[PDB]
Amino acid sequence: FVNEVRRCEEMDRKLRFVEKEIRKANIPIMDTGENPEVPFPRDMIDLEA
Amino acid sequence: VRKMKAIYHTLNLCNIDVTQKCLIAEVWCPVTDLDSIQFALRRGTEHSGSTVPSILNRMQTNQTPPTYNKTNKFTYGFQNIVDAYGIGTYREINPAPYTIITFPFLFAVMFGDLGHGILMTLFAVWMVLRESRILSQKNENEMFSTIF
Amino acid sequence: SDADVQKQIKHMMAFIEQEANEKAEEIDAKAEEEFNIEKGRLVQTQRLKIMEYY
Amino acid sequence: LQTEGSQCAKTFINLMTHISKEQTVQYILTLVDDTLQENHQRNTAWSYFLPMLNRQDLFTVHMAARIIAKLAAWGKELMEGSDLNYYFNWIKTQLSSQSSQYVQCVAGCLQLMLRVNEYRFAWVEADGVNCIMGVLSNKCGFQLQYQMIFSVWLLAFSPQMCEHLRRYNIIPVLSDILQESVKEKVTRIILAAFRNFLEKSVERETRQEYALAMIQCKVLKQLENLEQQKYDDEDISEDIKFLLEKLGESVQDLSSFDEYSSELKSGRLEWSPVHKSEKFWRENAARLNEKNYELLKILTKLLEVSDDPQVLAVAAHDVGEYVRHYPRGKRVIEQLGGKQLVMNHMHHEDQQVRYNALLAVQKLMVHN
Amino acid sequence: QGIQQLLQAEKRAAEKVADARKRKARRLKQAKEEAQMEVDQYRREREQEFQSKQ
């Protein structure tokens, strides 16, 4: 499974960039706290696009 | 994304899959909680559209099992203050229910003052009645991370 | 419940037939490109020599 | 071993109709299919055995189907396909996809008789092939989705059947099963059926099965991460490199100046990879100049007279990419007045045409 | 254990697909060796017009 663990880090590396990019424009984001369900690997192709 | 990576970590730690095209995992689990894992596993293969069941075989090895403690939010600090020295053996007598009383009691014989007994709990009632907005914050200094 | 040994031979052994029947049938149906169409490479090759006899 | 059983052919067939008990008939009919699974010809009375079967016995309707399809596919003296098209309509009531606990056995009978080349043409001439498409939706296709496309992989061996089944929504529903890929044998034939669909097609109409199949669906971008996995079957590890040299060639072939010319001259050309590709805009830097500036004057001609509810963003992507790669092209749109056009269309209500017109006017003025 | 019952069941499923890949490499030579029967059988198809024109 060492291919699809890399892409989950590059999707996380992209998400760490937007997390920094949100706060440079000074946008405090709400939480709306709810424990979500996990995406199936058929949704991982949708997540990259 | 971090839930998807977390499942992709433990499947690296799973079987070498040279037996079949199926993954074998020899995992530790409590015996009192062996029906809830089965009621989670019976619905685990149900969302994947498959009809073949996952089965749970109990082994009889002599490997040393890990130790686990049932733990609330209240009795967590007293539990990991015992485990900071040494975690106990399998089915040892746990000192942490008795430590819940005698460790603030031995603190009170050597720090005994009605005036500082008021300030020590009023600092603590402020930290438990306002703890909802403190878990909203990410992190602070360790004079408010280890103390909290 | 001692049904874990029976369900191992009921369901995990049933996928052994799915790897037997549903996989060898794809190799057995790999004769329209290896046996059926391969005859026409050697039948129409000799058909031009049949026209030389005509 | 087998007692040299060669006689009693009409004697064993004599017990087929006049047998009274249901279990005694179903035991011998299973004992008749147990002999005809790996042997020679023991079909004249077998078509007459259809008259005594499929009648008030579910265990003897499918066991008769295991003898009917196996005899039509095995043997030289049992080829009597004139009744097979009549049997395919007679089994179509059993091939109707409203079956409960019997559909998985009936689908194998449709794939057993369709093993021959012209026998599948006997079925497909009177099929009504949406019956395979009826189970192609959410119809509990765990093993059924393997059973239906395995017939389609047999139906693509003859090149005359490839252009016959293309009058359907075949490849886009076949791409919608490729995204799930949960069973790992459902998609292992779908990757193989697409190679059989294209390579066994001696025409030039595979470009129709380019413009429908992969440039308009999320299946071209799915071939890369199916290659990056560690597949074990050696027929799939060669299938991923065979489809990349195929489809890689197809992307290259797809981008061409003439095609682009048609897109902005014959018009109505959409969000195809002719615009999205950098390899398109890499080569044709002076093609907009080589048509005596009329190529720059016919893209904007369709942008100004027509409302274009969807395709207005596409030509706005054409001008924005072209002025990025050619700095002198900005002077052409300054004399043309198309700069005022993209300042109007950026205020439009649709977010697909508003963003690309916003992307165009921020690319017209990159340096001043 | 149950893994000892599945390591042998997968071996019977892997040997069944290994034998099917061997039969497709055996009938491949028989694809053209039986297509060479038209040298002996389709020669008589030219004998149908050999008595017609005479």
Structural class of chain D: mainly alpha
> H/E series of chain D, N to C?
HHHHHHHHHHHHHHHHHHHHHHHH
Element string of chain C (H = helix, E = strand): HHH
Backbone CA Rg of chain C: 24 Å
**Largest beta-sheet details of chain D:** none
Query: How would the global form of chain C be characterised?
Result: rod-shaped
The coarse overall form of chain D would be elongated
Q: How many beta strands in the DSSP annotation of chain C?
A: 0
Distance between the termini of chain D: 93 Å
Instruction: Please state roughly what percent of the residues of chain D sit in beta strands, choosing from under 5%, 5-15%, 15-25%, 25-35%, 35-45% or over 45%.
Output: under 5%
Cα(first) to Cα(last) distance of chain C is 80 Å
Largest sheet of chain C: none
Q: Give the helix tally of chain D.
A: 24
Share in helix of chain C: over 70%
Task: Walk me through what this model shows.
It is classed as proton transport. Keywords: proton transport, bafilomycin A1. Cryo-EM structure of bafilomycin A1-bound intact V-ATPase from bovine brain. Chains A, B are V-type proton ATPase subunit a. The structure is cut from a larger assembly and holds two copies of chain A, one copy of chain C (54 residues), one copy of chain D (368 residues) and one copy of chain E (54 residues). By secondary structure, chain A is an all-alpha fold. Chain A contains two helices and no strands. Chain A starts with 5 loop residues before the first helix and ends with a helix. Chain C is mainly α and 54 residues long. Chain C has helices spanning 4-10, 14-28, 32-52. By secondary structure, chain D is mainly alpha-helical. Helices cover 58% and strands 0% of the residues of chain D. The longest helix of chain D is centred in the first third of the chain and has 16 residues, at 58-73. In chain D, 27% of the residues are buried. The interface between B and D is small, with 5 and 4 residues.
